[PDB]
Amino acid sequence: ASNQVTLAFANDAEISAFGFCTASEAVSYYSEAAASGFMQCRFVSFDLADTVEGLLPEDYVMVVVGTTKLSAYVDTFGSRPRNICGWLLFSNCNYFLEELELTFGRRGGLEHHHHHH
């Protein structure tokens, strides 16, 4: 229902994208994109990373994780969380549509010390 979003799954030989300098800027842009139905974004599965153009590892994007139920939060493109699914990227590439149930939240910047997770 409310957490079910229709997403444009990237389906294109090349995926040109841009990301964000800061987490807060990414949070703003993804929030507006969500309110507008996410047509500004593409779900890019993590195995398609080598086809993405325009992003560097330090760029902030929306990462999607989960082996079953899905979570999404802002983090760097280079991050490799447990059970990464891929990303929502700002891109105009060709697509097909699928609905995902997605919980959007915040994960970054909660730890001062280093830990093994």
Q: Phi then psi for 95, rounded to 5 degrees? A: -155, 165
Which residues are CB-neighbours of 56 under 8 A, at least 6 positions away?
19, 77, 78
Structure tokens at 113: 């010390």
Q: Give me the DSSP letters along 75-103.
A: EETT---TTEEEEEEEE---EEEEEEEEE
Count of domains in the chain?
1
Which residue segment(s) compose the domain that 65 sits in? Answer: 1-117
Beta strands 4-10 and 52-53: pairing type?
Answer: unpaired
Q: Give me the DSSP letters along 56-71.
A: -TTSEEEEEE-SSSEE
Q: Phi then psi for 35, rounded to 5 degrees? A: -60, -30
| Residue among 31, 39, 93, 83 at smallest CA distance from 62 | 31
Structure tokens at 41: 């974004």
Structure tokens at 67: 């082996």
